[PDB]
Amino acid sequence: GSLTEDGLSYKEKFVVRSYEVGSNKTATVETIANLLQEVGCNHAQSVGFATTTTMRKLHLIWVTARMHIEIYKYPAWGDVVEIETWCQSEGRIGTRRDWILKDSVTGEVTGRATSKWVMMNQDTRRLQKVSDDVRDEYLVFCPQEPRLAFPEENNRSLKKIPKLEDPAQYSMIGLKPRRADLDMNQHVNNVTYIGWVLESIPQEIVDTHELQVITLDYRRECQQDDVVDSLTTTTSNDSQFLHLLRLSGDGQEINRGTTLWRKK
Amino acid sequence: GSLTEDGLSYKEKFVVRSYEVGSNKTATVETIANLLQEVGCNHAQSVGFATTTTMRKLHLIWVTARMHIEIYKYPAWGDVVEIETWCQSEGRIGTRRDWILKDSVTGEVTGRATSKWVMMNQDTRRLQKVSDDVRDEYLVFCPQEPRLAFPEENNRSLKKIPKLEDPAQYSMIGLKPRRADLDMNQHVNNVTYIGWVLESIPQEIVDTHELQVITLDYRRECQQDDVVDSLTTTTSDSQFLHLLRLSGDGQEINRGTTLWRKK
Ligand SMILES: OCn1cnc2ccccc21
Ligand SMILES: OCn1cnc2ccccc21
Ligand SMILES: OCn1cnc2ccccc21
Ligand SMILES: OCn1cnc2ccccc21
Known part of the structure; x- marks a missing residue:
């Protein structure tokens, strides 16, 4: 470079x-x-x-x-x-x-x-x-x-991103970081949160669509000993989703985001 | 290349x-x-x-x-x-x-x-x-x-690797693969199992030692819907015996050993 x-x-x-x-x-x-x-x-x-x-x-x-x-x-x-x-x-x-x-x-x-x-x-x-x-x-x-x-x-x-309201349409529960998810300063890598957001997208969408746009707000960091729940609800040839990452226990928000997918 | x-x-x-x-x-x-x-x-x-x-x-x-x-x-x-x-x-x-x-x-x-x-x-x-x-x-x-x-x-x-007997000295339970852990054919990447083995190594070892040798046997694949438990016991430089098994029935997926050198 x-x-x-x-x-x-x-x-x-x-x-x-x-x-x-x-x-x-x-x-x-x-x-x-x-x-x-x-x-x-x-x-x-x-x-x-x-x-x-x-x-x-x-x-x-x-x-x-x-x-x-x-x-x-x-x-x-x-x-x-x-x-x-x-x-x-x-x-x-x-x-x-x-x-x-x-x-x-x-x-x-x-x-x-x-x-x-x-x-x-x-x-x-x-x-x-x-x-x-x-x-x-x-x-x-x-x-x-x-x-x-x-x-x-x-x-x-x-664009401003709203807060997903329960019940979510889809969810992936009990997500936890492993050592490969940490950076050189022992903090969770910012890309790990993108992966966790996408965990709650149904397999059918992943198979028929391609991810075009992703916007992710970072509110709070997930610590090495924290457990995360990934929530998703459809908001919509294009599919749109609202996303929320929150701590497994008390439900404290760590991220919110949106994705836009186009048919393959 | x-x-x-x-x-x-x-x-x-x-x-x-x-x-x-x-x-x-x-x-x-x-x-x-x-x-x-x-x-x-x-x-x-x-x-x-x-x-x-x-x-x-x-x-x-x-x-x-x-x-x-x-x-x-x-x-x-x-x-x-x-x-x-x-x-x-x-x-x-x-x-x-x-x-x-x-x-x-x-x-x-x-x-x-x-x-x-x-x-x-x-x-x-x-x-x-x-x-x-x-x-x-x-x-x-x-x-x-x-x-x-x-x-x-x-x-x-x-060297032949023995099977770790319960109780393990250390454990990390409920490990599950995410999409980033899969290869282009939707199978769990072989490197993910190395990461899972290392999850049960205590932080104190990671801080004071460097990993010198790792040997890992692959017996069975973890499927995308499987959950894994990582078990470790000290056998000793520090040496450890490792076992990865399915969270439910305890079916073995991997066994291995690691050797660590003081920093
Ligand atoms: O990483 C900090 N940072 C802030 N403004 C920059 C401009 C160039 C390279 C790094 C920079
Ligand atoms: O960040 C992963 N990880 C955990 N224990 C290790 C030992 C050596 C190299 C990488 C290691
Ligand atoms: O590899 C995970 N994954 C799930 N949905 C995706 C969309 C684009 C790229 C990777 C994606
Ligand atoms: O994985 C295929 N394979 C088996 N023997 C090889 C020798 C060279 C390159 C690829 C080879």
């Missing part, structure tokens, strides 16, 4: 692996999400980082608030997918990281994604608006003119 | 990814096992396959009977690891696939693995041993002189 000529974005190519594909012999949305996190990490490494020197002093970290992914074509096993990523400040609210996925052979856009990140104290878990001196540190690595992966006016990435 | 000059082995380099590493900022043994399966699949693809034309007609597939991995140094995030793999027939018992892992910068051997595979009818799940001109079809892609990743006599990869 490498930073582009202007040094304001990063590009990396990936050959899709045999264990990264589903029954269609194309990459799963969890494989795609892992590749988005990998190119994000390589971009941060290329510019000297994911936290600045001032953030580490204050015990501040970046935390995902929302992930939105839209895929037009999933790459098949052995295909090469090129991914371009960049970051942009959204005032004191936080930062946005965007991605564009392309077929390396045709140059056509096969997918896009956007994510919202907020600053949080790693110890107290308290959120805060971005300060000026901390913001100044990373403004030099972001484009100044707006560059959006989702430029549309009433686009799906900014 | 590419076949070597003689066309009897395959080599591929991998840059270790951020999500592939554990607390130590080095690749997990499950990341290593996925890379071994990937280089195995690319080797099969490079020679025209991983079933032969006659195996597809007879509805026969290759199934793992045993996996043995020994790691001296786990590659850190961003490091490049080179892996060489080859296959060899073992009479009509089955075939063996071996691997050698190396640090791409120093050229030093950082790990090695061996696996035993048997032929099985995909529908009846019966072991039809390698017969007729089925053998002849893949003998041309294997070296004829023996080439072993574990040449030593009476080595760890050939």
